[model samples]
Target chain A: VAPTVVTYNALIDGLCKAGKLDEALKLFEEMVEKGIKPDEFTFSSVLKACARLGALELGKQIHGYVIKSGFESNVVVYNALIDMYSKCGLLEEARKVFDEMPELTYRRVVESYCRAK
Target chain B: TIMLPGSDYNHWLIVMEFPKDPAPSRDQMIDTYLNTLATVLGSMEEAKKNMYAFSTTTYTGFQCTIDEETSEKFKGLPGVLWVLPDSYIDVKNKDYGGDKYINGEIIPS
Candidate 1:
């Protein structure tokens, strides 16, 4: 609580919204260094930045890290990943990510594609 | 080389020709002349469609900003031949910045 969790997330969101993706990433790294555990929101926002910029390589790296860290089950992360892939024209990859969702009943591929616009 | 006898209009035409020579390079001269000639010929062909063809108002950008109905009406007039969009924008974004959609941008692949 002393490390200021909400402020850290807000800063990341603000930095990402301003298109200062690199700065947000750096801040995230700094937060981790300060022993602040990033929440699902932080990772999702970072992924949003990657999606917006079509930073495919960086997005993939973060994606792998998320899986290794066992955060891959997150529905929000899965949805964001799906949106990112589809928007980037990797529809097949998006389907694969969607299928990986544990709550498969709630995962609608068509809905994601429609909302992608 | 002897100067061929011609009027000021003919002289103007020759001066406009590229690579002025005593005896112009047939290939280059014909290419240059035909390039300019084709455009005028096209308009003339359209003009011939009308009984009394009023000359086309040529511009890189056309006056489409005016009333659409009026423009279409002008085209429909018996003496008025086909009215085409002013220009073609090439693949490259060269906008003549006029009322109608002009394809001024030419992108050479």
Candidate 2:
């Protein structure tokens, strides 16, 4: 059977959470090659991998994709962007994303930052 | 067949969608959807307990403990985009971003 976006998301998220970064990247590439669009959950989970590995270049590429695909306003995706930049020493960019968030999301990020330490 | 605390019955998380045209403040939207869904389920004699609604995002949905027969009936309801079972992940496994579990333990990242 053919795979759907949900299946791609499930496997990508599973691989990312498992720290199988290389496998996760490969799967992401496959998903794109197959023309399967990544949802908010997909980008969020993959960004966490970028944060963990300090893959700034890749993370930026994914961030660009998030914008081109119009998912930049997603709370979970932007929060993962904040985390990716913060972990990679790009606090300014993180702040930029944080600044653009709505009231509820702003509070959510603040709470996340508080818990990080 | 996932059981909630203090209940022996199974719980399922079902997502729903609203029509394209809409109004209502975000808070009102969520509360209204939950109330409407609860009323519908209550009429079915399924009891309006153990239900939840999502607060944010472009779309909306709810989760509830229900039986298989009711789940099938729910599928035919108006405005229900889809109804699927909810799966669990280990939230404590932050190191792994809440990966799935095995034998009550997080699978190694």
Candidate 3:
């Protein structure tokens, strides 16, 4: 049975690849309600779908869920959040995430900028 | 204030290739990181005093100071991936003529 978060993530990621962001998010919701705790693989896919759709509000929901689930140190999910925010035209919010990071060499001169040219 | 003899605080970034996920918790990961250092350094004493920074996200490692003595020893330690002195980085912001460079510029069609 594809009841585990791994299998759920597989299907959701496939949906996103098909340009079916709407469907991908629904399955994410179903998996969450089914008590299959989503991990990095799951968060990464759902956030990618949000970014593709530019679904800022829904992405905000996912962002909250990620924090609640305690993924502050997860670079993949953090990056997805930053991308989703930047793509949704929220540069200010995107910049805020950098301040909350740790020194995984996070204290060094890592570069990032969001602009429309 | 001419104290420059002690070889304690400096740069030696300790990195590992360990899996970060399917692990227990964030604290557990960090403890494992600390514990690994303890084993490598031969005691928790050396690790606690040397280590000053940790990154559990993208990098999955820690940074600590190592003198000339144990520098090579660190590299030889198991679970240690890359051990290097911290390098200087300078950020140079480029002006957005990026699209021009990408899509053949100098013409406004």
lDDT of 3 by residue, A1-117 (tens): 346766898999899999989898888766654456778888889888887777765676565445434585788888777767666776656665655555323222122224421
Model 1 achieves a DockQ score of 0.01
Alpha carbon deviation, residue A110, candidate 3 (Å): 13
The residue-by-residue lDDT of candidate 1 on A21-90, one tens digit each, is 7777777656654556666787788778777766654455455445433575788787777766766666
Q: List candidate 1 segments past 4 Å from native.
A: A1-3, A32-35, A103-117, B1-109
lDDT, model 2, position A15: 87
Ten contiguous residues with the weakest lDDT in model 1 chain A: A61-70
Q: Pick the candidate with the highest lDDT.
A: 3
Model 2 interface RMSD, one decimal: 15.4
- Kindly list the per-residue Cα lDDT of model 3 for residues B6-50, writing each as its tens digit: 112254445555553565564665666567767767887777666
All models, RMSD in angstroms: 24.3, 17.0, 21.7
TM-score of each: 0.42, 0.46, 0.45
Minimal lDDT window, size 10, model 1 chain B: B2-11
Docking class of 3: incorrect
Q: Where does candidate 1 clash, by residue pair?
A: B87-B103, B88-B103, B88-B104, B89-B103, B89-B104, B89-B105, B90-B105, B90-B106, B91-B107, B92-B107
Better of 1 and 2 by lDDT: 2
